[PDB]
């Protein structure tokens, strides 16, 4: 048998173009699931959340702020609707769009901080792949959340546009601008 997300999105055609992030994005045949709801314990041990499927990680990360705490079925419905909107607008596999958005939204170099009362001084450092994936997911979720706030537009629609813009690489998305600014700050003080 073939396992398809939500019963309609295949995982065999999805491929990852970044060698570094291949071991930290769980979408392939062993991590293929019908739903992003498994009732697993992925925070029990360090590095274990790399084995969590990336759709479930996005679903967990969309349960904010506070007013959404503990409501996972609502978030599953939001993700399903966003994937449907992505497929309608673009016509490609929404899983590939999500993978591309996560690849593009991840910063490659950050800046470490040495700070006293007067001023804080600044140094450039590298970023591990796990933190890259975590920060990409966080930036995408934050961008969707801020886009949907106090606006006549469903959170699912804003999430779909955020993923589309991030996978496109356009600067219209929140995550791309944040990554570019962080990389510019890291570059400027090498």
């Amino acid at each position: 048998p073939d396992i398809k997300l939500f019963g309609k999105w295949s995982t065999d055609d999805v491929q990852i173009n970044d060698i570094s992030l291949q071991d930290y994005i769980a979408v392939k045949e062993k991590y293929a699931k019908y739903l992003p709801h498994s009732a697993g314990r992925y925070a029990a041990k360090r590095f274990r959340k790399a084995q969590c499927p990336i759709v479930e990680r996005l679903t967990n990360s969309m349960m904010m702020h506070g007013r959404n705490n503990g409501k996972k079925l609502m978030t599953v419905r939001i993700v399903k609707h966003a994937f449907e909107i992505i497929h309608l607008l673009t016509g490609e596999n929404p899983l590939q769009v999500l993978v591309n958005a996560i690849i593009n939204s991840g910063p490659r170099e950050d800046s470490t901080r040495i700070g006293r009362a007067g001023t804080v001084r600044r140094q450039a450092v590298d970023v591990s792949p796990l933190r890259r994936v975590n920060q990409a997911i966080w930036l995408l979720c934050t961008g969707a959340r801020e886009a949907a706030f106090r606006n006549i537009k469903t959170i699912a629609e804003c999430l779909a546009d955020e993923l589309i813009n991030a996978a496109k690489g356009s600067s219209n998305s929140y995550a791309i601008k944040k990554k570019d600014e962080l990389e510019r700050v890291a570059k400027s003080n090498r």
Partner: protein
Amino acid sequence: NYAVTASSRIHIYGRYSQEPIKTFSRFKDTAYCATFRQDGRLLVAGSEDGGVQLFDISGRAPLRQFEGHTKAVHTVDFTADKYHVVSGADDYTVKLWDIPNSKEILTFKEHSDYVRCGCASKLNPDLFITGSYDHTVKMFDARTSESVLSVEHGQPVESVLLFPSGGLLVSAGGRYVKVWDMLKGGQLLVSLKNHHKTVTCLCLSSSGQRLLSGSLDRKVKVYSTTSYKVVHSFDYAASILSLALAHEDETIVVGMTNGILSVKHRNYMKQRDDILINRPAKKHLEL
């Protein structure tokens, strides 16, 4: 299901179902030209504000808004690839837009009055036809920035349609309905007048042979394409603004000047090795 646009409400009705199955009402004034996509999932619309709006048939708010036009917009249509939109507005211009990128691809301005009837081609992407009240029908196509062929109609062009095979373009203005072939550019093959008022709308049957024309005179004419002569007529209570045909000829829908619209629904067997002997069938005589 059929989408009926009326005043500021776009209503989606199912088969039978006198009450609308869905309603899009977020219009301050008189939405225009609701049209389905080839997948039946998205619909383009227009508004007197000037924005082109994409709607999901299960949502309540538009997915994409296009802000290029300055005045009211009356015609919108999809392309062969189900990802681009062609629009034309009352500021005498027609624009081509991209759906995922959410920006205008291209602009055309070659018309002198209200552009209020456009069509697109299923066979060839980027090939579309538009019509205005400046009596001309201009065909913008291919990959270029100027009209390749233009067509002159004697009266304001209410409707235009493209026949799929052979490239026959039918235009309806006043009483006249004119047929133009593309094998010879600007060739008026036939002009037909069988209505005694303005021909409002024109539709094509599921089979290519039948062609339907509705008009203000509360009568709908059915033509054969091979013969180009009348084959049937329909009579209605009010003037037909809109005419629509379902799959095959299952449902015929006409939308009127007034609120009401009319829907017109339609033991053991021989084995191979056995030798077959046929018995006579009894013939029945009349009384």
